[PDB]
Paper text:
New World mammarenaviruses (NWMs) are enveloped zoonotic agents that can cause human hemorrhagic fevers; they include Machupo (MACV), Guanarito (GTOV), Sabia (SABV), Chapare (CHAV), and Junin (JUNV) viruses. NWMs exist as quasispecies and contain a bisegmented, negative-sense, single-stranded RNA genome whose small (S) segment encodes for a nucleoprotein and a glycoprotein precursor polypeptide. That precursor is processed by the human peptidases SPase and subtilase SK1/S1P into three polypeptides: a stable signal peptide (SSP), a receptor-binding domain (GP1), and a membrane-associated domain (GP2)6,7. Three copies of each non-covalently associate as part of a mature, 3-fold symmetric homotrimeric membrane integral glycoprotein complex (GPC) that alone decorates the surface of the NWM envelope.
Selection of CR1–28Fab-bound GPC yielded isolated particles that, when classified and averaged, showed membrane-installed GPC with consistent Fab-bound ectodomain features, transmembrane structure, and visible luminal domains. Processing from these particles ultimately yielded a C3 symmetric map of the CR1–28Fab-bound, PV-membrane-installed GPC with an overall resolution of 3.8 Å. Collectively, these features reflected a map of the pre-fusion state of a mature and functional JUNV GPC trimer, demonstrating a full complement of CR1–28Fabs, an ordered SSP-containing integral membrane structure, and intact luminal domains. The CR1–28Fab-GP1 complex resembles that of its crystallographically determined structure, with a Cα root-mean-square deviation (RMSD) of 1.1 Å. The CR1–28Fab binds GP1 at its receptor binding interface, facilitated by interactions between a pocket on GP1 flanked by Asp113, Ile115, and Val117 and residue Tyr106 on the CR1–28Fab. Three glycosylation sites are observed on each GP1 domain, at Asn95, Asn166, and Asn178, with the N-linked glycan installed at Asn166 abutting the bound CR1–28Fab. A myristoyl group installed on the N-terminal Gly2 of the SSP is observed as a linear density protruding into the outer leaflet of the membrane bilayer. This anchors the SSP to the bilayer and dictates its topology in the membrane, matching that of the GP2 transmembrane helices.
Numbering used by the authors:
A (entry chain A), F (entry chain K), H (entry chain F): 2 to 58
B (entry chain C), D (entry chain M), G (entry chain H): 252 to 258, 268 to 485
C (entry chain B), E (entry chain L), I (entry chain G): 61 to 247
The structure:
C-alpha cells in the first residue's frame, strides 16, 4: 500500500525538484511506451485473430 | 544551558586556547559526543562550558552564595576515564593529561575529524614515527564519512517508491523499443501473389467476400505490403 | 602541521590552563611539584609545603600524638588549616583508629605550625609505608620519591608562602576532589 | 525481566498516567533508549518497570523479607542527570522535574517521536513562543527517520550483486538495441551493378568461382541487396 | 495539542505520582514544603516538622549538647526517630567532631521531642550558616529561606502528624536516597 | 568472488519476489541481447572476413 | 594498552577458555562494544585484558610495589549491571553469573554474532524450549547486518554524482534511440509527384529558383524519397 | 556545485575500477547520443525551417 | 551445538575461573559456600569459617563487648585478621555506635580466635536480624539460611585452614570490593 501512501502524500513530496523531475520522466516514459506499443501492431495481430472468420472488411 | 546540543557552531575564544585566538567547530563534528562518555576532549569541553555559564550567572547577579561541592565536578568528568589514565601511568604505558589534541583536517570543504589526545610517555610527547599508523586511518575514515553523509543527506528526501516506479517505467520503455524495432507480421499473402488487403484471407487461402476462392493456396504471414 | 595525503592537513589544538584556573568563581585546590622534594598543596587560604628527609623535629614524649580527628583541633589556630589537614589525611587514606598515629604541635606556642608523619621503610612501619606510598601515587600524577630503604624517612609539612612558578597541574585537583566527599570549596 | 528489550509493544496503564487510560508506544520508538543514559523519560520508565515487577513478585509470594537499600534506586536513576538538573536549578536556568513530556505525532502511520521533557522556570511551564524552534526540527527529523527506516528495511533483503547484474544487463541490452538499429554492411557490390550474392567478391572485384573476372572493378560495402 | 505542519500532531504525556508513591511495597522517605516556613520530612513512622524563626527553646546550660552520634541516643525513645535524625544530619553534611554542636532534650521528660540547630548569619557561625544552607539547597529542590541577616536564625524540629495536603514531590526523595548510603528502608 | 557466494546462497535468496523478478529480468535481457546481436550481422561481417579467400560459396 | 580499540583480531588463549584452546574473534564483532556499558561479555574481557597487561608489566620488571585498590576493579566492571543482576536474583527471575556465553555462527564467511549470557535459574541452565525465540531473531539480524555491511562498504567508495550522471546519460541515450527509431519528415512533396529535391519547395508548392511555379499545388511533408 | 568538487577531486576518485568504468560508460553514451541525434534529422528540420525562403539550393 | 536454520551454526564459549584467580599478581578476597552451613571467607593470610547454630560460647559478663572499631584491637594478635574482621563487618553494614554490640575474646589467652554475633529472630533483635540478613544476601549471591524463628540464632566465626574443594566464585569478590572503599589488597 505504499502507492496509496504516496498518493496521499503527493503535496509534501512535490516540493523537491528531483521528485517532480522523476515523476515527469516516468509519466512521459509510460505514455511513450503506450505509443510505441500501438505503433508496433501486436494489438493489430490480436484484433486480426479476434476478427478472423467474422467479416471480410 | 549545558552541553546537550540537539544539533557556524560551537566556538572557543582566547582565554580557552593557548594560541589566544578563536576557533569554530562544525556542528556535525561537535555532535559526535552528545552521548559519548569516553572522550577526554568532550569532558574538558563540558568543564569550559560550566565555567562560561558561571560567568554568565555572575553577570546576571543571582547572588546565590552557594558553596561548590566536589560532587558537581565529579558529575562532569568521567572518573572512570581518569582512573584508567592513572592505571596506565602506574603501569608505565603511554597516556595523556588533557593538554594537547590533534585532528585531521579536510581543506576542500572545511570538514575535520574529532580531535584525539596526543599521548605522552616519560614526560615527553609521542612523535611521528610512532604515531604514523593513525593519521592514514583517520583520513580514510574522514573521506568515507563525508561520502556516506552526503549519500544519507540525499537519501532522506526522495521516496523509494518513486525510484522503483521510474526503474520499472524505464524497463517497460526499453522492451517496447525493441518490440517496435523488430515488428510483427500482420496478415497473410498467397505465395507468389500480391497483397490481398483489405480482403483479409483465412487459413484456407480464400476470403469470405467471395473475391478469393477457397483453393487451399499456400499462405505466408507478412507485415508489409 | 604537515600536509597529509592529499587535500587533507594536520592540525593540533592545545588549551590554556591559566584561564580556567583563574576564572572559576569558586576556589579550587592546587597541587604542585617543585624540583624533586618540594611538594606543594594549597586550599582556601592554607598553603602547605611538604618535604621528606631524615630529621626528627617532634617526639611523642614532647608533643601531641594525634589519634582521633577530634584531637586534631589542638594543632592549629585556623579552621581552614585544620580542614585542609583532615582533607589531605583522608585523601591519602589513613585510618585514624587502626593505624599508628602521627605527631603535631599544640597551639599554645609562638613557633608556628608543623606536622610530621613517619613513613620509614623498615620494621613494622614498612607495611604502613606501602599504604601511604600508594596514596601519594594516586594524587600527584607522579612521585619523585626522596627516601630509600634507609633507617628513617620522615615527612614534614609546614606552611609557607606560595611560590609564583608552580606548574598549574589539574589532574591532581581532579583526583583530590574525586576521592573525598562532603567537601565544600569557599570563595 | 527488566528494561533491556532486544526489540504493539510497551504499554502503560491507568495507575501510571495522569489521564487514567492506557497508551502504547511503538517498538521502534521504545528501543531508542535501550542504551541511552541521558533521557529523563527512560529513567522514569525503568522506575515504573521496577514497581510492576515488585507487584508481580509479591503476587508470586516469594516472601523474601529483604529490606530495600538506597543502592538499588541509585542503580536505576542517572544520578549524573539529577545533579545536572539541580545545578541548572541553582543557576536559575530552565529545567524539568519528571512530570510532563511532549512528542510530535505522525497520524498517517502512527509513528511518533520519543518524548522530551517540557522544561520549567520560576514555577511555570515554558510556553509556545519560546518552545517554537524545536517542534519543526523534531517533525523534520521524524519524516527523515521514517524515510531512512523504510529504505534500510528494503536494503536488508536484496543482494547488491543482483542489482549490479541487472544494471549491466540493461546497459548491454541498450547497446545491442542501437547496434541493431544502425546495422552494418555485409558484402561488396560493384559500382553500377546488381547484388553479386551468393558469389562473394574479393577486394579485387572478382570471384574465385570464375563468374566475376578480376578486372579491378570498383567495390563498395553494402548491407542490403 | 495543536496540529503542527501537515499530517503531524502535537501531543503530551504526564505521569501520576500518587500511584508510584502508594504502590511501591517498601516505604520511601517523603519531603514536603508547605507555605514558606513549614518544611516536612517523613520516614518510616517518624514525621518531623521543621521551622525557622527567632525563638530560643533549648540552652546548653539546661539540656544535652550532642557532639557524637553515640550521644544522640539520649534524645529519643524510638529507634526510628534516632535513625531518621542521624539520616537527616548526615544528608545535610554535618561533621560531628569538627563543627559546633547542636542541642537536644533528654528522654527522661514527659514533654516530647524537640531538637534545635543554630544557623545564624553573623559572627563565627556565619561560616557554618553557609554550609548548612547549601545542604538544604540540595534536598528540597527549592528553599523558601525565612531568616535574613538578623541576630538569630534558629531552626527547630518537632514531631507532628502528617498533613493530608502535601505535594508528593519525588526529586527530594531521589536526592535523599542518593546522598547517604548504608540505608535500608523498612515496610 | 561475490558471484560464487551468490551461486552458493541462491536457495535462501529465492524466497523474495523482488529477487526472482530481478533475476528473471536479467536473464531475459541477456538472451534478448544475444538475439539482437545475431540479428545485427557484426558476427556476419566477422565470418565474411574469416571466409574471404577460401571458397566462393 | 587497554580495551579502547579503534578497529585476524582479538584472540584468547588456553588459560582464558575452559576448553584449553585459542579462539579469535573478528574485528567487526569485537568493535561492537568499544562504547557499550551494558554487556557482561565485554566487562569480563576488560578484566582479562587487565590481567594480561599486569603479566606484561611484571615481565618488564617495573618493580613499582603499588598495592591494588578496590577502586581500580570498580572502574572496570559495570557496578550498575552487577546490582541489576543481584536484584534479579533476589526477585527470583533468570540471571547469569559470567561463566557461559553463546552466539550464532555464520560458517560461509566466518561471521558470528556477539555472544550473549546463557541465563540461569534455580541453579540450572535455561534450555532450548525456553531459549528458542532468540536464535532465529539473532540469525535474521546477523544476515541483515552482513548485507547492510557489504552495502555500506561499497557505498563508501563511489560518488553519488557519478551515479546520477550515468543515470541521466542512460535516459538521454534511450530517448535518442526512440527518436532515431521513428524518424521525422524533412521536406515537401507535391501530391502525386516525385521528389523535388534538391529544389526545396515553399509552402505555396513552388521553388524560388523558378523550376517549380507557384501554382498552389498540394504539399505533404515527407522524410524519404 | 558538486560538479566542481568532482572536477577538483578526479585524481583521487580515478583509483577505482568502478569509477573509471562508470565515467567511460557515461562519456560513450553521451557521444553516441549526439551521433544518434545527428542521424535523426530533427536538426535537419530546424535547418530547413531556418532556410525556407532564403535560397533554393 | 546444533545447526540452526541454514549455513548458520550454534556455538557457545565458557571461561575458566582458575586461571584468572591464580594469575592476578595481587591477592584477591575469596568467598565460598560449602554444603549449607559452612560459609568461608579468605583475605590476605586470614581464612575464616562462619557457621550459624544455637550454641552460646561467649557471654558479656565474661569477655569483651566490642562497641567501637578502636576496641577491636583487643580481639586478635595479627593486623591482617583485624583488618579482615573490620572489612567484613563494614561490608555487612553494621553501625558500630547505633546497633547492639557483638562479643569477642581478648588476646591474652592461649585458646585462639573466635567472634560471635547475635542474629536471633525474636524480641527487639528481630529488627537487627533483618538488617544483617540483607547484608549477607548481597554478598554470597545465595544464602543457605540455617536458622528459623527459633529462640536463638548465633553466628560464630573461627579461623581454620582453607579446604581445597571450594567453588571459585567471583561475583562475591566483585560485591565485596564494590561495597567497601579505601581498601588496598596486598601481595
Ligand atoms: C601535562 O599538562 C601540562 C600542563 O598542565 C603540560 O605542560 C607543558 O609542558 C611542556 C613541555 O614541553 C611545556 O612546553 C615548554 O615549556 C616551557 C615553558 O613554556 C618552555 O620551554 C617552552 O616555551 C614550552 O612551552 C609547556 O609550556 C607546559 N605547559 C604548562 C601550562 O605547564 C604538559 O605537556 C603535560 N605533561 C607532559 C609530561 O607533557
Ligand atoms: C619511625 O619509624 C621507624 C621505623 O624503622 C623507627 O625506627 C625504628 O625504631 C625502633 C624502635 O623500637 C627500632 O627497634 C630497635 O632496633 C634495634 C635493633 O635493630 C634495637 O635497639 C631494639 O631491639 C629494637 O628492635 C628500629 O631498629 C628502628 N628502625 C631502624 C631501621 O633503625 C623510628 O623510631 C620511628 N620514629 C618515631 C619518632 O617514632
Ligand atoms: C514538579 O512536579 C510536580 C509533581 O510532583 C508538578 O506539580 C503540578 O503542578 C501543576 C502546576 O500548575 C499543577 O497543576 C494544577 O494544580 C492544581 C491541583 O491539581 C489545580 O490548580 C489544577 O487542577 C492543576 O492540576 C499540578 O496539579 C501539579 N501536580 C502535582 C502532582 O502536584 C509540577 O508541575 C512540577 N513543578 C513545576 C514547578 O511545575
Ligand atoms: C547562635 O549563634 C549566634 C550567632 O550570632 C549567637 O549570637 C551571638 O552570640 C555571641 C555570644 O558571644 C555574641 O557575641 C557578643 O556580642 C556582643 C558584641 O556584639 C558582646 O556582648 C560581646 O563582646 C560578644 O562579642 C554575638 O553578638 C551574638 N550575635 C549577634 C548577631 O547578636 C547566639 O548566641 C547563638 N545561640 C546559641 C544558643 O548558642
Ligand atoms: C556460576 O559460575 C560458576 C563458576 O563460578 C559455574 O559453576 C559450574 O557449575 C556447573 C554446574 O553444572 C558445573 O558443571 C559440572 O560440574 C562438575 C565439576 O566439574 C561436574 O559434574 C561436571 O564435570 C561439570 O563440569 C561446572 O563445573 C561449574 N564450574 C565451576 C568453575 O565451578 C556455574 O555454572 C554458575 N552457576 C550456576 C548456578 O550454574
Ligand atoms: C540473643 O538475642 C536473643 C533474642 O531473642 C536473646 O534472647 C532473648 O533474651 C531476652 C533477655 O531479656 C529474653 O527476654 C525475657 O524472656 C522471658 C519472657 O519471654 C522472661 O524471662 C523475661 O520477661 C524477658 O522478657 C527473651 O525471651 C529471649 N528470647 C527468646 C526467644 O527466648 C538472647 O538472650 C541473646 N543472647 C545474648 C547472649 O545476648
Ligand atoms: C502496497 O503494497 C502497495 C504496493 C504498490 C506497488 C507499486 C506498483 C507500481 C507498478 C508500476 C508498473 C509500471 C507501468 C506498467
Ligand atoms: C568476486 O570478486 C567475484 C566478482 C563477480 C563479478 C560479477 C560479474 C558479472 C558480469 C555480468 C556481465 C553481463 C553479461 C554480459
Ligand atoms: C552544484 O549544485 C552543482 C550541481 C551539478 C549538477 C550536475 C548536472 C549534470 C548534467 C548532466 C546531463 C547529461 C548530459 C545531457
Ligand atoms: C581546516 O582547515 C581550514 C583551512 O582553510 C581552516 O579554515 C579550518 O578552520 C580548519 N577546520 C577546523 C579547524 O575545524
Ligand atoms: C626518560 O628520559 C630521561 C631523560 O629525560 C632518560 O634518562 C630516561 O632513561 C627515560 N626513561 C624512560 C623510562 O624512558
Ligand atoms: C620523533 O622521531 C622523529 C623521526 O624522524 C624525529 O625527527 C623527532 O625529533 C622525534 N621526536 C622527538 C620528540 O624526539
Ligand atoms: C628548586 O628549583 C628552583 C628553580 O630552578 C630554584 O630556584 C630553587 O632554588 C630550587 N630549590 C632548591 C632547594 O634547590
Ligand atoms: C600541649 O598540647 C596538649 C595536648 O593537646 C594540650 O592539652 C596542652 O594544653 C598544650 N600545652 C599548653 C601549655 O597549653
Ligand atoms: C498518534 O496519533 C494517533 C492518531 O490516531 C494515535 O492513534 C496514536 O496513538 C498516536 N501515537 C502515539 C500516542 O504513540
Ligand atoms: C516569578 O513569578 C512571580 C509571580 O509568580 C514574579 O513575581 C517573579 O518576578 C518571577 N520571577 C522570575 C525570576 O521570573
Ligand atoms: C506563552 O506565550 C503565548 C503567546 O501567544 C501565550 O498565549 C501563552 O499564554 C503563554 N503561556 C503562559 C503560561 O503564560
Ligand atoms: C499554610 O497554608 C495552608 C493552605 O492554605 C493553610 O491551611 C495553613 O493555615 C497555612 N499555615 C499558616 C501557618 O498560615
Ligand atoms: C538529661 O540528659 C543527660 C545527658 O544525656 C542525661 O545524663 C541525664 O540522665 C538526663 N536527665 C535525667 C534526669 O535522667
Ligand atoms: C564459526 O564457525 C567456523 C566454522 O568453520 C569456525 O571456523 C569459526 O571460528 C567460527 N567463528 C567464530 C568462533 O567466531
Ligand atoms: C529447584 O530445583 C530443586 C531440585 O534441584 C527443586 O526441588 C525445587 O523445587 C526447584 N525450585 C524452583 C524454585 O524451581
Ligand atoms: C530443556 O528442555 C528440553 C526439551 O526437549 C529437554 O530435552 C532438555 O533436557 C531440557 N533441559 C534441561 C537442562 O532439563
Ligand atoms: C560438607 O560436604 C563435603 C563434600 O561432600 C563433605 O566432605 C563434608 O564432610 C561435609 N561436611 C559436613 C559437616 O557434613
Ligand atoms: C581481657 O579483655 C579486656 C578487654 O579488652 C582487657 O582489658 C584485658 O586486659 C583482657 N584480659 C587480660 C588478662 O589481659
Amino acid at each position: 500500500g505504499q502507492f496509496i501512501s504516496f498518493m496521499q502524500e503527493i503535496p509534501t513530496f512535490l516540493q523537491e525538484a528531483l521528485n517532480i523531475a522523476l515523476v515527469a520522466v516516468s509519466l512521459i516514459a509510460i505514455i511513450k511506451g503506450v505509443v510505441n506499443l500501438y505503433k508496433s501492431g501486436l494489438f493489430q495481430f490480436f484484433v486480426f485473430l479476434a476478427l478472423a472468420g467474422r467479416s471480410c472488411t | 544551558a549545558f552541553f546537550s546540543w540537539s544539533l557556524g557552531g560551537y566556538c572557543l575564544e582566547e582565554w580557552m586556547l593557548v594560541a589566544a585566538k578563536m576557533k569554530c567547530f562544525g556542528n556535525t563534528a561537535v555532535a559526535k559526543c552528545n552521548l559519548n562518555h569516553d572522550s577526554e576532549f568532550c569532558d574538558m569541553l563540558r568543564l569550559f562550558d560550566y565555567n562560561k555559564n558561571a560567568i554568565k550567572t555572575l553577570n546576571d547577579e543571582t547572588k546565590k552564595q552557594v558553596n561548590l561541592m566536589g560532587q558537581t565536578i565529579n558529575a562532569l568528568i568521567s572518573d572512570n576515564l581518569l582512573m584508567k589514565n592513572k592505571i596506565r601511568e602506574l603501569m608505565s604505558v603511554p597516556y595523556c593529561n588533557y593538554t594537547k589534541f590533534w585532528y585531521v583536517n579536510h581543506t576542500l570543504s572545511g570538514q575535520h575529524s574529532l580531535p584525539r589526545c596526543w599521548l605522552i610517555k616519560n614526560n615527553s610527547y609521542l612523535n611521528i614515527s610512532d604515531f604514523r599508523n593513525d593519521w592514514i586511518l583517520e583520513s580514510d575514515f574522514l573521506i568515507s564519512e563525508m561520502l556516506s553523509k552526503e549519500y544519507s543527506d540525499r537519501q532522506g528526501k526522495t521516496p523509494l517508491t518513486l525510484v522503483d516506479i521510474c526503474f520499472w517505467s524505464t524497463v517497460f520503455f526499453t522492451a517496447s523499443l525493441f518490440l517496435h524495432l523488430v515488428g510483427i507480421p500482420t496478415h497473410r499473402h498467397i505465395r507468389g501473389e500480391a497483397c490481398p488487403l483489405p480482403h483479409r484471407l483465412n487459413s484456407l487461402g480464400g476470403c469470405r467476400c467471395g473475391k478469393y476462392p477457397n483453393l487451399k493456396k499456400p499462405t505466408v504471414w507478412r507485415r508489409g505490403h | 602541521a604537515f600536509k597529509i595525503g592529499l587535500h587533507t592537513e594536520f592540525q593540533t589544538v592545545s588549551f590554556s590552563m591559566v584561564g580556567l584556573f583563574s576564572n572559576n568563581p569558586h576556589d579550587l585546590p592546587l597541587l604542585c611539584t617543585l624540583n624533586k622534594s618540594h611538594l606543594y598543596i594549597k586550599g582556601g587560604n592554607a598553603s602547605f609545603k611538604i618535604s621528606f628527609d631524615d630529621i626528627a623535629v617532634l617526639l611523642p614524649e614532647y608533643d601531641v600524638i594525634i589519634q582521633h580527628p577530634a584531637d586534631m583541633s589542638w594543632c592549629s589556630k585556623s579552621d581552614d588549616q585544620i580542614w585542609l589537614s583532615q582533607w589531605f589525611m583522608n585523601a591519602v587514606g589513613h585510618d585514624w583508629y587502626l593505624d599508628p598515629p602521627f605527631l603535631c604541635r599544640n597551639r599554645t606556642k609562638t613557633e608556628g605550625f608543623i606536622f610530621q608523619v613517619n613513613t620509614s621503610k623498615t620494621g613494622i612501619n614498612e607495611n604502613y609505608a606501602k599504604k601511604f606510598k600508594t596514596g601519594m601515587h594516586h594524587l600527584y600524577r607522579e612521585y619523585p620519591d626522596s627516601c630509600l630503604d634507609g633507617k628513617l624517612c620522615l615527612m614534614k609539612a609546614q606552611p609557607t608562602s606560595w611560590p609564583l612558578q608552580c606548574p598549574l597541574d589539574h589532574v591532581n585537583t581532579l583526583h583530590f576532589l574525586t576521592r573525598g566527599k562532603n567537601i565544600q570549596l569557599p570563595r
